[PDB]
Design a protein around this ligand. Structure first.
Ligand SMILES: CCCCCCCCCCCCO[C@@H]1O[C@H](CO)[C@@H](O[C@H]2O[C@H](CO)[C@@H](O)[C@H](O)[C@H]2O)[C@H](O)[C@H]1O
Ligand SMILES: CCCCCCCCCCCCO[C@@H]1O[C@H](CO)[C@@H](O[C@H]2O[C@H](CO)[C@@H](O)[C@H](O)[C@H]2O)[C@H](O)[C@H]1O
Ligand SMILES: OC[C@H]1O[C@H](O[C@H]2[C@H](O)[C@@H](O)[C@@H](O)O[C@@H]2CO)[C@H](O)[C@@H](O)[C@@H]1O
Ligand SMILES: [K+]
Lengths: 232, 221, 121, 232
């Protein structure tokens, strides 16, 4: 149930911030699916079932955020203005990226569908695949991911700033410090794509290849940033 | 989090019939962290601030260990500067207390001196082997240090076996935080003459006899 | 004097509390002893000397005592017999004779600290 | 209130996983009804009231799932990663099948409407009733039902795997084991239709008749599978 055996969970009691937060997460994953049109015929029914792969990817992504949220509020049981503020920023980012994720997930499902050879349907429905549009694709979703992890870092830092008020022990202080580092490290990968895309060194698709390729090397690039700080 | 925001907080608290910070000004061990926060130029800065607190009637002139302790435990002052040993008396009182990092001065941290409580055997004692037995097999044991600690806390014990228990205490964490920001005292024979020089210097400047510049002059000699 | 031999890892204090109720209802003393190596001290002492009145050990050691002639044949009435599980009586049987009273089934398990190890091997 | 008198309910306190879950179930049944258009005229009003039979069937179906969920989280009070994962898979399946159920319920209500003689409205609105489409109908809803019961079996097995951590007694162990069997047995009936439909032995509607006929013989076929394992 819990992550650490040395951590004393201050947020075992459910609060308004957590209840409100659960409503928003439930609404996000629910409306992602149920924002679709109701099938009126067999043809619509089969079309609607092609959407489950894109939705599974979206849902998996949203619960992962929900989990991090659950663990934070479980650890510290925080309920102050600044926690409320940072919490709102988080849910706000989530909400604005629900329908854009539905889009990205459908787009990438078609691209990966073409590769593997499952389907051969058109991508002209999405509009013109131009350099500017493919760059904005990275910058958009990259800015989204960066923000979510950035906010998680700020939230843990707020708990670190209130370590004494929360009566955090040496183990708990260590966890909190490690959780900040983790979220900043997670944050850097989208920050690095975003910056590369915005400068655009090549002036062509090469830029987008590199930017996209940093996510495939998430684990190794995270280890490099972590290793650089430890080596000094 | 900073020393420089205490005067503002004190103005706020004095309106509600309460002090902000009360601590032992007589003993230099308590005033040294503020004095040594920056550093000389650092000692001049740190002490002038301490002098300005008494000059602005924020702190009392003859604030000692007893009236500071009592005031905090009674619920008259919002803050105090003390060691592990002082916690048990707070627990006795009905005061929801916290132990934390010492305030920063001029951005940099206040460097408190670090002491190692130590037991020595008197050279002119016939019970040298009996004392060694007591110290080793009875005191410096898990059971032995526990007994002392439940009376008045020892702080971060020297026993290796006590690491888990120390690490579970939030007040110990705050103690270790300040200990890292401070430094261990040299054991040298000149420490006595040093401490006396600082004890007088702080009292003279606090009461209003010698100037801050003239205090460091007499103390360096 | 009623003397009982049971291992020191068992509940001899509790066995004594039963023995204390026995003395109240009869007048016989019930002392409970726990000597080291009683499984191999019983067949030596009980053969020659007096030893205990009643011996407590896992059923596996009792066949050797039975063959040697160190144990009396148990004759419990149907009503007492019926109070215990029939499979338990089988363990305390050597050559069609009941050689002891079954108390409890014992098996080793993995005892683990949930704090140090929540999902053990 | 409780199913078993020998069961010690570990989940009497409400948690985030349960709160989140309640939001999703409420949203599913709510949006099923309220996804319809708002009547603007008397004609729309009467049309909208024809939808209550299909909705009653859908709602009845969803609360039955909600009940099983309520009982599981009541029994074990689980809150770990794997429980979260399996729980998400469940809610995901639910969500993707909300609008398809609305469809099936409306379709079958017209078919049963025609039989009994209450109404005589067209089924051409649903598209062509072809062998391929009627086969996909079984495979779709059959795959949905199979998954829900499959997930409930996995959830109970996760609790069984943590029997010692949960301090489950002999009665509780027995219940858990029985709950796994129940859900696998429930799971098999849709698994058997689905397989029969996918192979398609007859190459015509006969396939669909048999596949559909297994649900009418749910109770007896469940007893056969249960009897086979006990007889050995
Ligand atoms: C890997 C294999 C899977 C590839 C799946 C690709 C899905 O691609 C996506 O399909 C759905 C099919 O409903 C289309 O979606 C369309 O139908 C749904 C049906 O409810 C409507 O809600 C929506 O208005 C319409 O856009 C998307 O516009 C298309 O981008
Ligand atoms: C057994 C007797 C009952 C038979 C009921 C059959 C209902 O059949 C169903 O009716 C509703 C009538 O609103 C139709 O629904 C139609 O009207 C509703 C009215 O809000 C709109 O939301 C929807 O866009 C439209 O599809 C379905 O398309 C039809 O399939
Ligand atoms: O005040 C100067 C004085 O400070 C230190 O003594 C501390 C002692 O270490 C603590 O345990 C505590 O009890 O308070 C004392 C000060 O009040 C130095 O150790 C000592 O030499 C010096 O005189
Ligand atoms: K809508």
């Amino acid at each position: 149930v819990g992550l650490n055996p040395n951590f004393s969970f201050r947020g075992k009691q459910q609060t308004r911030i957590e209840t409100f937060s659960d409503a928003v997460f439930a609404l996000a994953i629910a409306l992602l699916v149920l924002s679709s049109t109701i099938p009126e015929t067999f043809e619509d029914l089969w079309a609607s079932m092609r959407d489950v792969i894109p939705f599974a990817i979206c849902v998996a992504l949203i619960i992962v955020i929900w989990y991090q949220h659950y663990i934070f509020f479980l650890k510290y049981g925080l309920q102050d203005k600044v926690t409320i503020l940072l919490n709102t920023i988080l849910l706000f980012v989530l909400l604005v990226y629900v329908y854009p994720l539905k889009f990205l997930a459908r787009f990438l499902s078609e691209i990966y569908g073409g590769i593997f050879g499952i389907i051969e349907t058109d991508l002209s429905r999405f509009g013109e695949y131009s350099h500017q549009n493919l760059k904005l694709l990275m910058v958009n979703y990259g800015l989204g991911a960066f923000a979510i992890f950035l906010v998680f870092s700020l939230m843990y830092w707020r708990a670190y700033k209130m370590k004494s008020l929360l009566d955090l022990n040496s183990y708990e202080i260590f966890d909190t410090k490690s959780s900040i580092i983790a979220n900043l490290l997670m944050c850097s990968v989208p920050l690095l794509s975003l910056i590369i895309t915005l400068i655009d060194p090549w002036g062509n698709f090469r830029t987008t290849i590199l930017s996209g390729f940093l996510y495939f090397l998430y684990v190794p690039i995270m280890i490099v940033f972590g290793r650089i700080t430890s080596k000094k | 989090k900073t020393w420089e925001e205490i005067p503002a907080l004190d103005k706020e608290l004095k309106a509600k019939g309460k002090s902000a910070l009360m601590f032992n000004l007589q003993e230099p061990y308590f005033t040294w962290p503020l004095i040594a926060a920056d550093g000389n130029a650092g000692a001049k800065a740190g002490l002038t601030f301490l002098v300005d607190l008494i000059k602005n009637k924020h702190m009392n002139a003859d604030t000692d260990y007893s009236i500071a302790e009592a005031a905090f435990n009674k619920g008259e002052t919002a803050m105090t500067i003390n060691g592990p040993w002082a916690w048990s008396n707070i627990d006795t009182s009905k005061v929801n207390y916290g132990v934390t990092v010492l305030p920063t001065f001029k951005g940099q941290p206040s460097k408190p001196f670090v002491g190692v409580l130590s037991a020595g055997i008197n050279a002119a004692s016939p019970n040298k082997e009996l004392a060694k037995e007591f110290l080793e097999n009875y005191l410096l044991t898990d059971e032995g240090l526990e007994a002392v600690n439940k009376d008045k806390p020892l702080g971060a014990v020297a026993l290796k076996s006590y690491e888990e228990e120390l690490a579970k205490d939030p007040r110990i964490a705050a103690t270790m935080e300040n200990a890292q920001k401070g430094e261990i005292m040299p054991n040298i024979p000149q420490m006595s003459a040093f401490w006396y020089a600082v004890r007088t210097a702080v009292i003279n400047a606090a009461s209003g006899r010698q100037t801050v510049d003239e205090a460091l002059k007499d103390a360096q000699t | 004097k009623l003397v009982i031999w049971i291992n020191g890892d068992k509940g001899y204090n509790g066995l004594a509390e039963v023995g204390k109720k026995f003395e109240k209802d009869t007048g016989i003393k019930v002392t409970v002893e726990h000597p080291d190596k009683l499984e191999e001290k019983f067949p030596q002492v009980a053969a020659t000397g007096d030893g205990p009145d009643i011996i407590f050990w896992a059923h596996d050691r009792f066949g050797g005592y039975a063959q040697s002639g160190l144990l009396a044949e148990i004759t419990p009435d149907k009503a007492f017999q019926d109070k215990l599980y029939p499979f338990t009586w089988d363990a305390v049987r050597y050559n069609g004779k009941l050689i002891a009273y079954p108390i409890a089934v014992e098996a080793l398990s993995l005892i683990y600290n949930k704090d140090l190890l929540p999902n053990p091997p």
